[PDB]
Amino acid sequence: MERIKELRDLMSQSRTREILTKTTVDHMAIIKKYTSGRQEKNPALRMKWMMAMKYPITADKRIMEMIPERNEQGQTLWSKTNDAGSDRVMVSPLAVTWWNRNGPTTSTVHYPKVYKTYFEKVERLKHGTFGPVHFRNQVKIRRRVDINPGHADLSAKEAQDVIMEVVFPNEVGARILTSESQLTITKEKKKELQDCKIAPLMVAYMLERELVRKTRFLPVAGGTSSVYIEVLHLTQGTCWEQMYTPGGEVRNDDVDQSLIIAARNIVRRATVSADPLASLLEMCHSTQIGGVRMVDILRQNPTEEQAVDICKAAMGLRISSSFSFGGFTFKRTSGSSVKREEEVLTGNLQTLKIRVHEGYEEFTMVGRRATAILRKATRRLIQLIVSGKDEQSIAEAIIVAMVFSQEDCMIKAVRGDLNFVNRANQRLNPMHQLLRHFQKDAKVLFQNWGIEPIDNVMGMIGILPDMTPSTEMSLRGVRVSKMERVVVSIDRFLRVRDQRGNVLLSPEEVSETQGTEKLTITYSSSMMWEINGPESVLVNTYQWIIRNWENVKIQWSQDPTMLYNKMEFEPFQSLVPKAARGQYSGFVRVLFQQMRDVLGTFDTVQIIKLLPFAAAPPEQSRMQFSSLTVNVRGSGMRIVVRGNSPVFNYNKATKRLTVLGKDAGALMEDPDEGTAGVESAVLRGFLILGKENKRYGPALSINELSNLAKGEKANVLIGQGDVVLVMKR
Amino acid sequence: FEITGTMRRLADQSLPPNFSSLENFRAYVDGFEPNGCIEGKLSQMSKEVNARIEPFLRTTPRPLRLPDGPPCSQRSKFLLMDALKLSIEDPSHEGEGIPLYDA
Amino acid sequence: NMKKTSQLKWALGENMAPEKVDFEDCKDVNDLKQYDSDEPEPRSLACWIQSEFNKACELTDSSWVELDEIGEDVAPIEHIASMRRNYFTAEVSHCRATEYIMKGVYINTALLNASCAAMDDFQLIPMISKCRTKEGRRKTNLYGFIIKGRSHLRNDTDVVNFVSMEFSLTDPRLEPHKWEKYCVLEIGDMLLRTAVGQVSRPMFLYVRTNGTSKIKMKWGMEMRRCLLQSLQQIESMIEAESSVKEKDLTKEFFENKSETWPIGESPKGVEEGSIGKVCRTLLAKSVFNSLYASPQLEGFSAESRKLLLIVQALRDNLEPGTFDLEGLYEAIEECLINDPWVLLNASWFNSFLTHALR
Amino acid sequence: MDVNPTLLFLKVPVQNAISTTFPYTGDPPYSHGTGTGYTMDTVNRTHKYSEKGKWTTNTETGAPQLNPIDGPLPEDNEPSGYAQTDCVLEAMAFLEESHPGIFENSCLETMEIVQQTRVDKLTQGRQTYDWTLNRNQPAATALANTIEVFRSNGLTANESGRLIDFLKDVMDSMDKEEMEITTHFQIGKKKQRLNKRSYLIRALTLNTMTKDAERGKLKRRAIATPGMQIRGFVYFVEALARSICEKLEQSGLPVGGNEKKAKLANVVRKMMTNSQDTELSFTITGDNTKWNENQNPRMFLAMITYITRNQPEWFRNVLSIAPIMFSNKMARLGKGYMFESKSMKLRTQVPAEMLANIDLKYFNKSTREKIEKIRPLLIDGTASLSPGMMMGMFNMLSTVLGVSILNLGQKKYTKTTYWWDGLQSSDDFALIVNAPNHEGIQAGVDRFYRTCKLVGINMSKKKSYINRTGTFEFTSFFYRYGFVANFSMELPSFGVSGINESADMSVGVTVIKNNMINNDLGPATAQMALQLFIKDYRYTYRCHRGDTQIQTRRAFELKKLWEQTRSKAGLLVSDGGPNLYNIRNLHIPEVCLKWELMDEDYQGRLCNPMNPFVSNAVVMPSMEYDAVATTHSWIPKRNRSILNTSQRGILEDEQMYQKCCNLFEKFFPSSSYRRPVGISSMVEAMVSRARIDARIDFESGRIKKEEFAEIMKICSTIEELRRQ
RNA sequence: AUCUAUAAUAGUUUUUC
RNA sequence: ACCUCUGAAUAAACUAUU
RNA sequence: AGUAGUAACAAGAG
């Protein structure tokens, strides 16, 4: 009634009637932003200039009745001058600080409810626990982290639609909530906010603070969850780490993810030790995940993962030999596999490397709405027997099975602009990208998969590409049907065998992906970086060599065997490719032996660079190496044997060794350093004498030096665009 | 969304020199296939259009040439190394008392 | 408010702006022409700016900044930060550059507040600073007086004229070229004591007409960021060493004074100073960047950064190569015109080239 | 001992002390007078770079237009705009061949964007050159004036609310024989009726001015403000260029911050890994000389034509309009000049529109030469500028062109032992060259330089250098085996931002936290920064501690509030309370940080929704950096300079606009939360909503039949008033 | 595992003779 | 002359916050 | 005069 009377009043005036008639709803936004021009260019200067004025602050005209014109000292609090383009009056800051001491008082009891997020921050800081401060060689990595967690199974647009449904039911337009998560959250918030006495706009902003996810790229070390990101300034520094645990309640999915990350790191590190089982146990007892001991989490966490199950089995716990893939819990009833990287060409003409599992295997798929039995061979689906609930559940199960099968048809079914790198050029998991692509639109995948006639066995139905229950022909190898932890023993080499004696898990089955933890992973031992990421592992390994250079040098001179067997090099050896560990070790050991027998050719930097590669059991081959590869976030990063490298660059001007762009420390020149330009640790069986010498014909390559014999000097294009004279001993 | 009238006339004058209508240029671009154009233009271009790299050795750089003229003069808003202060023992914090009284 | 006398009307540029007329009514005037838009007159580098910078880097006997309070320390990292901040504050509060910071902040704040409050008045503004002596007693200092002209400032570059009367003991006749803008009086005989006897020296008043704008006054009021600029770099160096040493080195740097950095030059050669010396030097450099801000400084910094990067690449054995190095030199030297600070920076760059390539 | 700060680099690498080379504590340089000299210099230089091109006279505007496309191949290393169209088309073709489907998918996304974008997208921005007033206006104000003029001239296709319909209206306006406008003077309204050529000159005109507060530049430079007619087309072209750039690994746009640094580092490391160990690698820290004064709108039209092959005609037309309008663009000369008579002691403003036929005796030598060079180009008070992209426009399309030139450096294209790749962001670039020896490196650099010359890109020799790969500079980011921190760049952000007390406190603490996270701001320096910010905040807002005797106008009120308070820690710093911030709680709003320390009555007064300083409820007015609104979230006064002009009716008009908008919000509660959409008028929408709501309330029994009948009667009265 | 909400404000980056 | 008014908003991308 | 620097301010408008 008041609204319609005010509208009738505005329609009676000539100008307001013109505005109301000639302005459409679309142009209402334009006229709402319409202004004469707020000449604001330097707000800091403008504020400093205005705070010297008598009345720099505007206020509503009610202040002339709510606040007196003058205070006790007679100072004026407001003036009758109106602000430009409005009926607001000009007031002094004295008016605001007078209100804060003499104004009417209301009940501020609903403020903690309306601003629950900020008071939640206050509570998390209040009940948080601070640990010691450790000064370390920090290696921060720019990654996408969430600063506002929002709701788990929601996006920004879905959260906005849910908010509109909850707060403005009659303004939702054509949107209908389809996701079951949206319906559940909508019902929950409608019941919780029933008979609420807050303004609807304020309620909408509360729900935005509560439900809308926000992620950003930040240079982050430690946990990437919101509770750790909000205190990232406090907990992480350039040279220090502050141990801290937020005081609130920790989400369990973050615990699961961090446990998976820690277990994978621990298992991969333990695989290279002499006794993997003891190393795994002592690492699991020394690991904390968000202020909680890892062993307790393992005892009370039902997470289906290979490394987590290996960690459980090492401690006598019962495991479920299962894993997750695309929202389903797989379990290998029978079969075996060996991973193998195979490059494939996508349907949209993209080249990528996919970890292909060889061998024949059988699986069972379990999901919240569907169940299936899967048999497969190398990149070939033998059969799939789905027994889902509705059409969409069976469709999702079929899509997941097709992606899992790694069928070349599935690869060639890719269309559109499907990206396999991050927006920051970070490599993504190809299988996850294929899943997300085919879960948006799978018509082309089903079309190109094929068809196959069914023989009507047991009455199991067929399925057509458009999701219909045919009885004559079905998708190739797909059939439709209708609707436990075990005690294990773990070997010395982390081989998990069932009570009967069959192998269930192995270290080779552990994923090679190097992820990051949602909750900060604290490791307490001599090497706090022993289960850290590859960048931290490399930097800290070379810094450990630098700091201990005196006794390491003495041991290298006297007893190299014990030096190569230091436990500190094992995290490094977990980065060297498994097939090349022995070759690199043997090559580097031969280089070191030649370096010892040729006095004066003592290059400190060469020894420091090549030492971590000698920690593996040596395999003797005649292959020459110009560079050694190290896996860093999936890409083999080479360390060039001669000269600097992206991983390892030594600066002679500063005497400062920089690894992956992180300072590792300054070396000190040895008296036995060779100030003569003679190198003996570059070629396996050839000693560098000097620069180019045209007397010995044209320059050749390192990979063609076998034909040379004893004393045959030659010129080799070893290194980055350099030719030097080498001789054979 | 059709380009007609004044917009068409402007479009007919927004082309390379050897095209008279936007339709002709569109037809040329639609049928365009790369046929050694860049290589031929590079061969035609004279060898004087190059980016020669001159090494920057330790003996390469020269000192900067400072201008010649009368010596520079002080321009700061207050004295820096020549300022004299008349001081009083006033147990008051920064900006408390009346500036004129303190002066 | 000072009386609008003839001497103040002249000194503050009263009625010096020409009458604003229409081009119709003055197009036939013989000498009517475009504003003088010539380049600045070149000036050569004099030795006094190096002495000014040397004096701005020194340690004073008084504490010049009284930093406010923060919350109580709870985290251990907060206690470590408080210890390091104690070292930083001990180094930075007793530096002449901090006195310049406080003096400039006070002067610019007073000028801007008077400019907004009294558009059409000549205000007398004393130059006041507060300090704590070595024995902790508060002390109020008077440097001189400032008279503000009219301040009907429309643009951010509009100039307000002021007259600066400042006490000094420096004889203007020893370096006359430095004081070309000043009229120096002799207003008294101050009694100083060197070791045991009272020495009588003349007390001079350096009077000049000067001007500033709203943007300059704002950036003078915000002069306390020089502390941040110096201290962030100092702490970056400290933490860079701590990262490879795996322990805090703040106390080792500030007390043991084992690690030194080349910070100056003597007739013997390059001289290296402690972490506190480097902190004071960087603070003085930032303060002088604030006091002598000019387009010449901006151009020189931006253009000489490239040459610094090229020299660094040469020192890293990265085989640097240029294409039009003479063009780069011309671009750098285009900015060296008449600003003493920029000319001193150019001399420093020449010294750096001499030392960095031998 | 003479103190030499520069000698610090003898031990500290330059990248690790790069903050010392940014003197960002003093005031930046400003421009004092006119920008006409710089604009004329830019026009003359742009035409000089293309002087060997073909001259034509535009049949629609009469402006002389210079066409450098397919001009003679250069014989020297001077800058030139003689881009070859076939070379640009071949670069586009090879870019499409190396990334199959990039243009098709980008066109699909851009078609969706074009079909869905609303007209109020044009209001996003500060200023738009209003052709109805021949000066800059706020973007919303310029759009409103343009829409009103179009409606008065029977151009009402924009009433759909879509941006493409507004562009159709612009195109239709181009064909009107006469466009009518309305002018104010000393305050009456006068109708002015432009002719076809005059309106066409106004619509193709970009305003010009000087750039104030620019760091690192000795001399000032000109900048441009696009008009209302071209903004939508530029938005659509930039949307297409953005779609293309998102799919390119070498692109430096549109990624910024830590994401940009991570992408650049990953791309550089991928290039290093792909490089063979037995070959040299060099990186070029490269700039381009006068990129925007040498690139031609005709080449952008060619690029858009190649990109939109096999697309619907309407999409190609709507994308092509922007380069076409940009190749016929005119430039406003600016304010003009001021003339000073020393003898008669007078000064006067000379408008830029008189420079066509003004006597040249007044001007000095350089300005006279500028005017003599530019007079043939002057038409209708503007300068004909056919070549060049004016200022800060089509940056991502420039990035696309640069990335295509970089992409030309694969071994499949070089067909030799050298190859190149690198990074591209608008005009700035970094180039990595690999070759078996130094001769190959030189050959690859030469080939890159000559190819850029072919496509009209001139590599600044005096601002570029080359060294072994591992250190470079790109878009002011300094890479030394990884991007280093640069604190001096963010140093001006510290301080009182000038919104209000609450917002400024939040900004200060958030800036300290962000610089701790990103720019390696140490904890001790963070505490000192907090102290300095608190000091500046207290001085700026006259809110020193209650227990001090700082004599300000606000000090008595703060003393009174301090005396009556029981728990002093609960008072905000704006109210004279103490500073409770430290490193651990930088992320917490002040009102929430000390909420439980406040007195009940003080807290009730501070957070009182019935207070006049901010427009069970809570305080609400656009609450940037203000989590909880208090009485300290006030709004300062607006500038009152408009009251002395003839545009002072805009104040009354915007007051009535705000009144109508608030009345509308009384009918559609979600309008403020989410922008409403609709072709119906405001009164019609409100009446329909009132009728449906009254019917529903009657049906559910919330109101009785008498009130329903009263609402229906008032609605009928409003409908009757609507027609008359 | 993925991950450019929308909008507003401020800040930052983006030079011929 | 009194009187009266007024102290001055480029583009794009990004970042931060709401 | 001074600020300042390629053009301005040294009050403007009514």
Ligand SMILES: *O[C@H]1[C@@H](O)[C@H](n2cnc3c(N)ncnc32)O[C@@H]1COP(=O)(O)OP(=O)(O)OP(=O)(O)OC[C@H]1O[C@@H](n2c[n+](C)c3c(=O)[nH]c(N)nc32)[C@H](O)[C@@H]1O
């Ligand atoms: O966030 C990561 C991880 O922590 C999270 N995750 C893992 N497990 C869980 C559980 N149990 N609950 C909640 N979240 C979980 O998912 C993310 C995994 O990321 P990433 O490590 O990059 O992927 P991963 O390396 O695990 O590979 P993925 O594609 O997800 O496959 C998982 C699992 O499936 C095995 N597998 C695939 N194929 C095609 C196989 C096959 O043909 N034969 C056999 N025997 N195994 C196959 C993968 O090798 C992994 O073992």
Ligand SMILES: [Mg+2]
């Ligand atoms: Mg560059």
